[PDB]
Design a binder for this molecule. Structure first.
Ligand SMILES: *[C@@H]1O[C@H](CO)[C@@H](O[C@@H]2O[C@H](CO)[C@@H](O)[C@H](O)[C@H]2NC(C)=O)[C@H](O)[C@H]1NC(C)=O
Lengths: 34, 49, 49
């Protein structure tokens, strides 16, 4: 697994935009288009 | 409403993302497993040699 | 760095609340990488990270 492979320098850096921010962007787009 | 059902009753709707995740996981697993190959050497452990 | 019955490995030997088989020997994970080694003296398991 991705979290189970952190043994040989395998670092999975976090995404810059959190899922909450993406959800907020989608909600803003939906409100704007509506 | 149908859209929800179209996803509720079907597990293959997210085929693309699942395939991408599976490909990445398989690549990482193969890379990790490659460390346990002798490659013609006596052993695959640095301390052993 | 710990020498456990022939394995020389660098890590942290914490305490693991996992139930193992009666006859106790080394451990392994999905990627064939050791993640838990037994305690020869006391019947308690130790994780490696
Ligand atoms: C390994 O040897 C040690 C040394 O005697 C044992 O330690 C004893 O363990 C019992 C069981 O918990 C205790 O009641 C004693 O008080 C301990 N004594 C000492 C001096 O530590 C240990 O039990 C042994 N382990 C095995 C698996 O045989």
């Amino acid at each position: 697994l991705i979290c189970a492979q952190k043994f040989n320098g395998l670092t999975v850096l976090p995404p810059l935009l959190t899922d909450e921010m993406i959800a907020q962007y989608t909600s803003a787009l939906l409100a704007g288009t509506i | 409403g149908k859209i929800q059902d179209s996803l509720s009753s079907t597990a293959s709707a997210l085929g693309k993302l699942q395939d991408v995740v599976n490909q990445n996981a398989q690549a990482l697993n193969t890379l990790v497993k490659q460390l346990s190959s002798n490659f013609g050497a006596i052993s695959s452990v640095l301390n052993d040699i | 760095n710990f020498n456990f019955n022939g394995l020389t490995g660098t890590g942290v030997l914490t305490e693991s609340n996992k139930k193992f088989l009666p006859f106790q020997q080394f451990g392994r994970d999905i990627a064939d990488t050791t993640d838990a080694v037994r305690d020869p003296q006391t019947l308690e398991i130790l994780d490696i990270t």
